[PDB]
């Protein structure tokens, strides 16, 4: 449950985020001082349109790409067995919560200077991209 | 299938809310009364 | 990087070729990720970090089962920002 904590929250935010920029376009395409409880209802439940499947299945990946560990026999299995169990239940919790409670609780309730350092090297990667699949292979 | 499942829950909201509330109070009782030990039993 | 080549800048590509238009659909699937991304790698490493400090009863085993994750979560993100894109721009050109 200690290692799970870093993913239960990663489940929520990636949904909250695509909803922060979804509520930054219906604000640039429409007025600004006119919005109802249904006008706010539609915008957040339209961020769950895209990322929806993306995460519940990616935390379905986190929970299943771990199953093989249960095949640990004897002493070591009795040890990390219980760890795998709790890590999994706690994920199935946050995952099956980000589809019943998370979208709702977020509806009932300096990024510049990292974007500046990334994309100079991003476009640089688009130079001969086949050369960066070569440096990677060297890593 | 996930999207439809998001929509149905959003519809439920406020019956769902109280379920996650009663779970939170129930998930607080069990924890308090949970046995304890250094490690899981590993002996054969 | 898929729904970026499935929006309206993805009406230009399927019909005809335009590298400086799929590079614009890639530059946005790049500044739209930097926000959800940098925080995913944040909450993952930040919440995974405390256990890496192995002092106390039982710490030993946890710091060992965490270091690989914490370490693997530095090169997994950092590197993937350059491998996945510059390889989807290379695979979108084969079927084309």
Swiss-Prot record, chain C:
Q: Where are the transmembrane segments?
A: 38-58, 65-85
Protein location: Cell inner membrane
| Expression triggers | Transcriptionally regulated by CusR in response to copper and silver ions.
Look up the domain of life of the source. Answer: Bacteria
Q: Which family does it belong to?
A: Belongs to the resistance-nodulation-cell division (RND) (TC 2.A.6) family.
Subunit note: The cus efflux system is composed of CusA, CusB, CusC and CusF.
Other facts noted in the record for this chain: The cus system plays an important role in copper tolerance under anaerobic growth and, under extreme copper stress, in aerobic growth.
**What is this protein's function?**
Part of a cation efflux system that mediates resistance to copper and silver.
Q: What's this protein's name? A: Cation efflux system protein CusA
């Amino acid at each position: 449950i200690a290692i799970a904590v870093g993913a239960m929250v990663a489940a929520a935010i990636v949904m909250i985020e695509n909803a922060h920029k979804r509520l930054e376009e219906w604000q640039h395409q429409h007025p600004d001082a006119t919005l109802d409880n249904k006008t706010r209802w539609q915008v957040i439940t339209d961020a769950s349109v895209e990322v929806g499947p993306a995460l519940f299945i990616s935390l379905l990946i986190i929970t299943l790409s771990f199953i093989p560990i249960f095949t640990l026999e004897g002493q070591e299995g009795r040890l990390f067995g219980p760890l795998a169990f709790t890590k999994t239940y706690a994920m199935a919790g946050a995952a099956l919560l980000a589809i019943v409670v998370i979208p709702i609780l977020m509806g009932y309730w300096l990024n510049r200077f990292l974007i500046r350092v990334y994309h100079p090297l991003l476009l640089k990667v688009l130079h001969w991209p086949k050369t960066t699949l070569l440096v990677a292979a060297l890593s | 299938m996930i999207e439809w499942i998001i929509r149905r829950s959003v519809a439920n909201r406020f019956l769902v809310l109280m379920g996650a509330l009663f779970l939170s109070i129930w998930g607080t009782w069990t924890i308090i009364n949970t046995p304890v030990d250094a490690l899981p039993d590993l002996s054969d | 990087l898929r729904h970026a080549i499935e929006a309206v800048p993805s009406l230009n590509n399927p019909q005809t070729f335009s590298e400086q238009k799929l590079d614009e659909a890639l530059y946005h699937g790049a500044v739209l990720r930097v926000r959800p991304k940098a925080m995913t790698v944040a909450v993952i490493i930040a919440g995974l970090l405390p256990i890496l400090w192995g002092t106390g009863a039982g710490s030993e085993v946890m710091s060992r089962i965490a270091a690989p994750m914490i370490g693997g979560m530095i090169t997994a993100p950092l590197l993937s920002l350059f491998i996945i894109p510059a390889a989807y721009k290379l695979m979108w050109l084969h079927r084309h």
